[PDB]
DNA sequence: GCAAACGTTTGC
DNA sequence: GCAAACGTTT
């Protein structure tokens, strides 16, 4: 674990070594933009913007990616709903339920699954307003996704419209599935990932690991 | 000539 | 009244 300083909130950004190559420039960028961003009340709170950089990449082979945080109640961990109230994580969980067969769970969290990194493309939004901070995160979102793509061998993207042309942001031909936003083809997406992983000679994902009991 | 942008459906 | 996907558009 390392740490860097930025001019505006949250002042200190704590990151895992794997992200080193990218921080210098993330700081340049955030310093240009935080000024405005922070004038809006955000989801998540600024202290939580970057907590997912505390996550290692070395041990990750899938990235499950959505466009930006939940309009309200973002925790800084993508997809996470601690009280299991958010529509998107609940639907993901029904999906995983049906593949695995596990039907008696209490919640679900993509961020506790081995080899998986859940990700928000944009790192914050204005409270109640989806994609409202796209222009602030723009180059940062790109910088980071390219970095994640150097480590994972499958990028799974939720949202046909937004990620229709996600390839245009990438510097390699990484395997990329573009599914629907969480709103029965989704099942097929989580299983094809494992098919692809094996064909490519890699360990599959135990999606049942996400379950909270 | 697609990859855009607009409008319509319908799902939350 | 929203946000996403889809079907025609330029």
Numbering used by the authors: 1 to 183, 189 to 218
Question: How is this structure described in the published paper?
Answer:
However, vaccinia virus uracil-DNA glycosylase (known as D4), also serves as an intrinsic and essential component of the processive DNA polymerase complex during DNA replication. In this complex D4 binds to a unique poxvirus specific protein A20 which tethers it to the DNA polymerase. Three dimensional structure of D4 retains the overall fold of UNG proteins- a central 4-stranded parallel β-sheet with α-helices on both sides. Although the UNG-specific motifs are very different, the architecture of the uracil-binding pocket in D4 is remarkably similar to other UNGs and five of the six residues forming the pocket are identical.
Here, we report the first detailed view of D4-DNA interactions from a crystal structure of D4 in complex with a non-specific undamaged dsDNA. The structure of this complex for the first time reveals the DNA-binding interactions by an UNG from the poxvirus family. It also represents the first three-dimensional structure of a UNG bound to a truly undamaged dsDNA and provides a representative snapshot of the initial interaction between UNG and DNA. The D4-DNA structure was refined to 2.89 Å resolution with Rcryst and Rfree values of 21.6 and 26.5 %, respectively. The final model consists of two D4 subunits (chains A and B), a DNA double helix with 12 nucleotides in chain C and 10 in chain D, 4 glycerol (GOL) molecules of which one is in each active site and 118 solvent atoms. Conformations of the two D4 chains in the complex are also very similar with an rmsd value of 0.15 Å for superposition of all 213 residues in A and B. Each D4 chain binds only to one DNA strand. D4 chain B interacts with nucleotides 5–8 (ACGT) in the central part of chain C while D4 chain A interacts with nucleotides 23–26 (AAAC) of chain D. D4 residues at the protein-DNA interface are Ile67, Pro71, Gly128, Glu129, Thr130, Lys131, Gly159, Lys160, Thr161, Asp162, Tyr180, His181 and Ala183. Polar protein-DNA interactions with the phosphate backbone involve hydrogen-bonds (2.6-3.2 Å) with Lys131, Lys160, Thr161, Tyr180 and His181 from each D4 chain. D4 residues involved in binding DNA are localized in three structural areas: the extended DNA-binding loop (residues 126–132), the Gly-Ser loop (residues 159–162) and the Leu-intercalation loop (residues 180–187). Distortion in the DNA chains C and D such as bending and kinking are small compared to those observed in complexes of hUNG with specific uracil-containing DNA. Thus the structure of the present DNA complex suggests that DNA binding induces conformational changes in D4 that may interfere with its binding to A20.
